[model samples]
Target: ACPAPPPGQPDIRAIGYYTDKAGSVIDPALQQQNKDATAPLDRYAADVARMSDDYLRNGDPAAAQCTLSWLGAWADDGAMLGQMIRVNNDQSFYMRQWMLDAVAMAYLKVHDQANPQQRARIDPWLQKLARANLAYWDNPKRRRNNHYYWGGLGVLATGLATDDDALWQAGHAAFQKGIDDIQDDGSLPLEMARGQRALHYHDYALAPLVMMAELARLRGQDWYASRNHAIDRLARRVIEGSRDPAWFNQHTGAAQLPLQASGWVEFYRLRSPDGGVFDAAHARGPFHSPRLGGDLTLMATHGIVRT
Candidate 1:
């Protein structure tokens, strides 16, 4: 039986947050304000994910059912990001993409558990959010950067969940673009260009690209080896940069902020467990990233793997 639904969160229409010239640092005040503004959405995503993860950990059908029921409530209410009037800034769009990614990831954990009625209510709403993501990111004018990759993951996850070939292809294009963007030296020129956060951005960029590759592999695509194995080159560079930032520091002429091993490292380790990348994953994981589908460590162990 479904649990009683919580109150629906308000729709987020417009959001704005200030950033530095290099787009490395957020304005402290606006960062807090943005956090407060988006807290409800964040909590909502986390709650759904936690429920899904609970089922994965404990093998509880009720937990999976709870996740779907919670999501269905939001879908039925037509709130919780169903209606969007305006996206006021890059931050707004980024948050939407993050939420979409997290939600789609959570849904993937228990997709088979959803009955026809649950699918009827929830899948279209998810596809609706994915379409909105595609509409914004398919713009040629938008810079092909980490944001584009994150949007790609969000859309691709939805495509995987709902088996939408068009959305899958659209998302795959972004993954290819990311591979094409990689330089021979395993560095992304766009990410290296960030003054102080060069290494930070590199780490950030890898999260989505790695996730996309994992998803592609699930579909029997060899994105990890695409473009002459460019993604591996990028991963190696990021792993090296996370440890020593000297190359990034010299290139950008600014000491980069520290780059910790992120949850995506586990995915890479799972697929290609070799060298320092594998070491780092074992040393620094049990990782979790809400947007990458909370508790990746669990996914690494129990989640579906088509490869």
Candidate 2:
């Protein structure tokens, strides 16, 4: 493990999903405190994203203005907080990946709001954050762990928002390489090594890949069919595994329980909505990820139903 910074000298480049060690829970209250702290940023970013979708649904400049206001606050700091988000190593690609997603979502929908004045400032800051992420993930010494897939989502989101076609393609290519690691049995070898959390990790891996596949589709690409439908196969495995933990328990030797996937059902029906799954998720509400435009069920339900 990396050593902590000296007292009174915190590294400005340190960041991570949690200040606590991975898989280590600090406490319920402590965890809740962290969530509370980040909620403002997450909520505002979600608001910007919601307005962005409205702009897409209806050509409204006001909606774009709303997005720009929220975005201005978030980008004003320019990844400065990114440097102080950890207790050990000064930075985390995992945390940065999600941050990039939230910002990129706003950036993509802010086309109408992008003026020379704003772009002169926001674009460069956004690109700086994107480059920071790319440099870290693209480093030769880094391992292509499961987070790499999640990281790719950020890269792809940034690429789409900034009109960086090369970065967008690079993101898709990253997903291709990621899903290729899925065994014929649909198990991710790297994630499976997480011991008892193998099943949980498998589910985590699916979230970003599922979103990335949707993005590829929106971009007129066939990521669903890529690698012979590896993404579909993995989804199928996760669905089946969530319903019954016995299979996973046998593999990991831990008394695991079924997954609580109330919101995931929204994404499940993205490819095929005619199934009764839509009704179930409708009653339960859709999953909300800051990176995926928050309340995805709300944003996608109308579009999916129209089609």
Q: Model 2 scores what on Cα lDDT?
A: 0.63
In angstroms, give how far residue 140 of model 1 lies from its true place: 3.1
What's the residue-level lDDT of 286 in candidate 1? 76
Residue 123, model 1: lDDT of: 85
Cα TM-score per model? 0.92, 0.79
Give candidate 2 misplaced runs (Cα > 4 Å). Answer: 1-33, 36-40, 53-60, 81-85, 89-92, 110-113, 139-142, 262-264, 273-283, 302-307
Give lDDT tens digits, candidate 1, residues 167-245: 8998899888888888888888888877888888878888889888878777788788887777888888888888888
| Highest lDDT model number | 1
Over 4 Å off, model 1? 1-5, 13-19, 80-88, 304-307
For model 1, the run of ten residues with the poorest summed lDDT = 79-88
Candidate 1 TM-score, C-alpha based:
0.92
lDDT of each: 0.79, 0.63
